[PDB]
Amino acid sequence: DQAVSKQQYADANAAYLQSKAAVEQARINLRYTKVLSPISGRIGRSAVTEGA
């Protein structure tokens, strides 16, 4: 109903997509911990035990 400018909407939508990208960066850092095995195969011993 055009109660706000179109440009103020474009600024709000840009801030919204920038913040979604910042949450994606924080989620990628939260996914690097709890480290995923990149491939599938036989795994050996753990050179780093838990606690190090």
Binding site: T49, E50, G51, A52
Partner: protein, 39 residues
């Protein structure tokens, strides 16, 4: 003739354990590294 001790041997089953060298490592070792700085 000589009389000597003679055994009568027969078949049986065995287990065949093999000896192999090595060291013992600790189960859960944690080197206390600081993660933060200062004296």
């Amino acid at each position: 003739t000589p009389e000597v001790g003679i055994v009568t041997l027969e078949a049986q089953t065995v287990t065949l354990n093999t000896e192999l060298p090595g060291r013992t490592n600790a189960f859960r070792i944690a080197e206390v590294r600081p993660q933060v700085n200062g004296i």
